Design a protein around this ligand. Structure first.
Ligand code: IPT
Ligand code: MG
Ligand code: MG
Ligand code: NA
Ligand code: NA
Ligand code: NA
Ligand code: NA
Ligand code: NA
Lengths: 1015, 210
């Protein structure tokens, strides 16, 4: 029957014998246990060691497996994805389905995971009541047997499937058999951009419920106009025999204090001409001055639902955390507790580099702590309902949640092919309805989403209305079909730009500022995805935040995304390395597109994380004379754990500092008068840095946590006094091939054939391994590459424009190399042209002035042909012979920063180990740049000027030729790139050019100057 | 003190190269002990009679952004025509130059002055790579105005009919010029991107006779 019906190739069959969905149950038989959320004796975990065998197709599964352990099976940990155990390959594909698009059929070769468990059941569980099994997540479809007998079937990889095992179990030892199919008709609705894995990847548990039981309960909280009064309404449903002596009590607790209680027999109010629900009752509790829930202050109450008899005998209790909050859209603004939210959000996939798609509490906690520490207040469940514990943690730690249905059909042509088809309405409805039934009591969930990237079909409209009808307490959003359809309360585009329209036919992405004011449009706009953080990215992040702050109806967005989806593989030395698409023999694949995170897979931050934290600050600052104005962007909390630290420094040298307690009301202002600052000793620029410091530890942060900062230039005293003229004078030695300059122990060598400084000597020690030459290219970032590949070039991508113009292979042709002796210096003058097939791309004109103090002043003037694509950089590079431990600089830092991603960086004196000046992006590229640098120190060398630089053991050549960071090898010496100018990195998306015009090197003529000396 | 700041000489040196003379200068402009601007220059005069002037200016970050960064002089020459390769033919400023076209323009000198009834800075042309006036040619990438009225006279005279032609011709050649604004005329209206706030500025001119 099972192999004959092929339920996994029929979208009409999404389950067999599956129980109704409901909120989290534990069936406590003690009310105090329910109140305190202590473990329940009636809820057992079946996680641990199971038996597992892999088969290529369900037809290959032997019948004996139903009754007897297979001797060829292995003992494996559950929950798990079987790809993470090495049984077959995980597949990384973005849009294109991993299977032939032929709905509702899947491949005949359909990897089949045969799980089994021998376990014990207490006799008391079978003597009364109902024993069910709960599978929180099975990917993608499964049949279940118990003691050899068939129980049921389930689809939807991201919601729990529950089955009554009461009739199947015996006292003592029992054996479960679970046949998990990798592919099913459900796979057509699970085309999310992520690793395609399978298995029993979430918790398995057993729940005992009494025969007479709470089968569902819904908790609603409504408020008066100023939120000083609330009514809690709890609808409770039962199954079992109705008796007049049955009662429901709902009690509400604030900590140890019961604040309200109500008791009633079953029997709901009249609904229609046939009466009401005899199996339901609704309790209403008054609450004066409720403590309100927000991400700022996650006040929670506990609601306990007791099923009992009139004489007082408890039958069972269920419970949940209650957060008193109202979510509503009014006058085009999303309001929480009457105040307009500013969503500092991120999209978060459930990903672990070792365990795949199996989530654990420790990883979830680490994510939430890192999010809150970096000024995020919201998370989108991209693109499926999460592990149940996620919502509990968001309730308790305080994050706003977008809960999203497990529906994505991105690879269909057109995208709405299934979602507009009524044949698929049943399968889609269950993914929406069962999510709402599970998650509706969680205060952290503020918005429902209909799924992701499935076009706009009539099924979306039906399901949109279904939610609006069942749950009026939360807006519904959905991006498909152009982000502003009739199926969304919120304009929720993905990667719409701040100022630039992208008028794609049918589904345009308007500038977000322009989108708001389109004729007739009144809704709020919150980007469901923006700032694609792929590799070296988040260029232009500050532009979004400026606009979010300026425009009331631009209420923020969710960054794409939290964590890189890299996976651990092991090399010959057994060393773990980070793997992406294709590294498992998976083909077709989408290579490094699985890595878009603000953090590495192990939760180490990318440099971009600090840019997000700074732009998402909850305190804004202005300076006027001696006065600092601090504005709070909190809606509910006073600044009761904040002090402002201020510091004034002269080019990195501290001059004065101080502390002032912050006492600011939500949305209020505080004026801080800085004391009269002493006059600086010498020339230079004074800089003011302020930081907001949290003195006290919280649930989400340590004592001394920095939550906000800002810098200003104060007074500058320009240096007018000439240094004392040195007595030494450099000597020019002219030969046919070289111009040499000597000054005591030091010597400079300019090759007359090449026109470059080819060597320098301090004593008899050589300083260079490669000559000092102009550089106009970079190892291409992911944003430079986009979707371009060797097999399918995207001629519009930055990397391809540079390649085709000859930027990477242009040869320096010497035009001029002269030497002159000045009164106190030797002057070398050079001119080079870079050409590709008869075309002059760049001209570089330089002077090198070496004086008696041993300083070499370099002046560079570059011409760039207006009709060549704007170059990635205008600078100099060389390979130094020196390898030194430390890098010391006066400039923006301490972390990596680029021209369109440097707002988080501060100007100061920074000192780091050399390894910190390299950013280990899994896909290697130009990295580690620091901008606005006036002084750089490395070993015996000092460079002064106004430049950007990176410094590492890897050439640009090696970085661009190496696909994986673990394959990089430190070269001899140290590669130095010093740029007068550097192009933006972009990142509004990573599939089209995204570097804004103002960060492109289009001026045509460029000037910079450096001084190279010994410090 | 921008209007009253006096140039203090910091350096003036002359060197002889293989085929050129190199004059190096540095100046500081101060007001009550505060250094507003520093100007460092080289003048390189070669065998072909061309003088290459390289200018590097520092502007104190806490001084209000300057109206221009350039050179001026009063020429002895009064010529009938002004010929230039740059934006024109009409007066244009960095935040009002979209209507102007890059081409070869040739106008009578009087057309290079705009007779605003209340006199002010006027007649600038931007994006100019070559200017010709009598025997003189200047080349580079600059903005310029040219007339018989000094900036000093224009600012001291409240009506255009009270202006008098001065001896010779006043040339203002700017590497950089501030926007004119106009969103209104009762509060500062020059947009941030047209203010001279970069702190360090570089431009080059070649002066020669043709
Ligand atoms: C590459 C685009 C055509 S689709 C684009 O791909 C991204 C890659 O990380 C994300 O998955 C986005 O959600 C998706 O819109
Ligand atoms: Mg099916
Ligand atoms: Mg997708
Ligand atoms: Na806003
Ligand atoms: Na991706
Ligand atoms: Na405080
Ligand atoms: Na690379
Ligand atoms: Na005047």
């Amino acid at each position: 029957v099972v192999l004959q019906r092929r339920d996994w190739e029929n979208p009409g069959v999404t389950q067999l014998n599956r129980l109704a969905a409901h909120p989290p149950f534990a069936s406590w038989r003690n009310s105090e246990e329910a109140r305190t959320d202590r473990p329940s004796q009636q809820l057992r975990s079946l996680n641990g060691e199971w038996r597992f065998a892999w088969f290529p197709a369900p037809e290959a599964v032997p019948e004996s497996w139903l009754e007897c352990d297979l001797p060829e099976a292995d003992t494996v940990v559950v929950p798990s994805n079987w790809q993470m155990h090495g049984y077959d390959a995980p597949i990384y594909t973005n849009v294109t389905y991993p299977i032939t698009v032929n709905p509702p059929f899947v491949p005949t070769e359909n990897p089949t995971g045969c799980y089994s468990l021998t376990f014990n059941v207490d006799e008391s569980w079978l003597q009364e009541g109902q024993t069910r099994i709960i599978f929180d997540g099975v990917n993608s479809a499964f049949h279940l047997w118990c003691n050899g007998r068939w129980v049921g079937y389930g689809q939807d990889s991201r919601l729990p499937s529950e089955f009554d095992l009461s009739a199947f179990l015996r006292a003592g030892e029992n054996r479960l058999a679970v046949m998990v199919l990798r592919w099913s008709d459900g796979s057509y609705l699970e085309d999310q951009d992520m690793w395609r894995m399978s298995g029993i990847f979430r918790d398995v548990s057993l729940l005992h419920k009494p025969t007479t039981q709470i089968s569902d309960f819904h908790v609603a909280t409504r408020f008066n106009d100023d939120f000083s009064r609330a009514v809690l309404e709890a609808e409770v449903q039962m199954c079992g025999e109705l008796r007049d002596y049955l009662r429901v009590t709902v009690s509400l607790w604030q900590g140890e204090t019961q604040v309200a209680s109500g008791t009633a027999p079953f029997g709901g109010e009249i609904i229609d001409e046939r009466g009401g629900y005899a199996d339901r009752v609704t309790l209403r509790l008054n609450v004066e001055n409720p403590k309100l829930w927000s991400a700022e202050i996650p006040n929670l109450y506990r609601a306990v639902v007791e099923l009992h008899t009139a004489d007082g005998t408890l039958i069972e209790a269920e419970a949940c955390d209650v957060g008193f909050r109202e979510v509503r859209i009014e006058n085009g603004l999303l309001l929480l507790n009457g105040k307009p939210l500013l969503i500092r959000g991120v999209n978060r996939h459930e990903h672990h580099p070792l365990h795949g798609q199996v989530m654990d509490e420790q990883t979830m906690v680490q994510d939430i702590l890192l999010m809150k520490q970096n000024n995020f207040n919201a998370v989108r469940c991209s693109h499926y309902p999460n592990h149940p514990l996620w919502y509990t943690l968001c309730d308790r730690y305080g994050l706003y949640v977008v809960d999203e249905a497990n529906i994505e059909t991105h690879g269909m042509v057109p995208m709405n092919r299934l979602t507009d088809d009524p044949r698929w309405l049943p399968a889609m409805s269950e993914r929406v309805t069962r999510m709402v039934q599970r998650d509706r009591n969680h205060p952290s969930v503020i918005i429902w989403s209909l799924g992701d990237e499935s076009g706009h079909g009539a099924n979306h409209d039906a399901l949109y209305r279904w939610i609006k009808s069942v749950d009026p307490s939360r807006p519904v959003q959905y991006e498909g079909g152009g982000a502003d359809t009739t199926a969304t309360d919120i304009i929720c585009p993905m990667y719409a730009r701040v100022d630039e329209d992208q008028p794609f036919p049918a589904v345009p992405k308007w500038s977000i500022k322009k989108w708001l004011s389109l004729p007739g449009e009144t809704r709020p706009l919150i980007l469901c995805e923006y700032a694609h953080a792929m590799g070296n990215s988040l260029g232009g992040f500050a532009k979004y935040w400026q606009a979010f702050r300026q425009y009331p109806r631009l209420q923020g967005g969710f960054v794409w995304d939290w964590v890189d989806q890299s996976l651990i593989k092991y090399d010959e030395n057994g060393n773990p390395w980070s793997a992406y698409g294709g590294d498992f023999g998976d083909t077709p694949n989408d290579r490094q597109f699985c890595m878009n995170g603000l953090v590495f897979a192990d939760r180490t931050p990318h440099p971009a994380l600090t840019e997000a934290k700074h732009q998402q600050q909850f305190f804004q600052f202005r300076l006027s004379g001696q006065t600092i104005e601090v504005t709070s962007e909190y809606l509910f909390r006073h600044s009761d754990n904040e002090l402002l630290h201020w510091m004034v420094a002269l080019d990195g040298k501290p001059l004065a500092s101080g502390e002032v307690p912050l006492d600011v009301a939500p949305q209020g202002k505080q004026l801080i008068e800085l004391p009269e600052l002493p006059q600086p000793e010498s020339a230079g620029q004074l800089w003011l840095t302020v930081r907001v410091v949290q003195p006290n530890a919280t649930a989400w942060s340590e004592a001394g946590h920095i939550s906000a900062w800002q810098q200003w230039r104060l007074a500058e005293n320009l240096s007018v006094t000439l240094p004392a003229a040195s007595h030494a004078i450099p000597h020019l030695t002219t030969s046919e091939m070289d111009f040499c300059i000597e000054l005591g122990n030091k010597r400079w060598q300019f090759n007359r054939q090449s026109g470059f400084l080819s060597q320098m000597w301090i004593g008899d020690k050589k300083q260079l391994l490669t000559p000092l030459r102009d550089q106009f290219t970079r190892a291409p970032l992911d944003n430079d590459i986009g979707v371009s590949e060797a097999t399918r070039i995207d001629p519009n991508a930055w990397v391809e424009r540079w390649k085709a113009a000859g930027h990477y292979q242009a040869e320096a042709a010497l035009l001029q190399c002269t030497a002159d002796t000045l009164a106190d210096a030797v002057l070398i003058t050079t001119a080079h042209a870079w050409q590709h097939q008869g075309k002059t791309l760049f001209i570089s004109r330089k002077t090198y002035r070496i004086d008696g103090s041993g300083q070499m002043a370099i002046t560079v003037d570059v011409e760039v042909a207006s009709d060549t694509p704007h170059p990635a950089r205008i600078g100099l590079n060389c390979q130094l012979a020196q390898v030194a431990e430390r890098v010391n600089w006066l400039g923006l830092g301490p972390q990596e920063n680029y021209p369109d991603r440097l707002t988080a960086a501060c100007f100061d004196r920074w000192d780091l180990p050399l390894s910190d000046m390299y950013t280990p992006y899994v896909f290697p590229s130009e990295n580690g740049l620091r901008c606005g640098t006036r002084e750089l120190n490395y070993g015996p060398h000092q460079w002064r000027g106004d430049f950007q630089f990176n410094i590492s053991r890897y050439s640009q050549q090696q970085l661009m030729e190496t696909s994986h960071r673990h394959l990089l090898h430190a070269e001899e010496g140290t590669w130095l790139n010093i740029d007068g100018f550097h192009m933006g990195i972009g990142g509004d998306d990573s599939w089209s050019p995204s570097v804004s015009a103002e960060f492109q090197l289009s001026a045509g003529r460029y000037h910079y100057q450096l001084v190279w000396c010994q410090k």
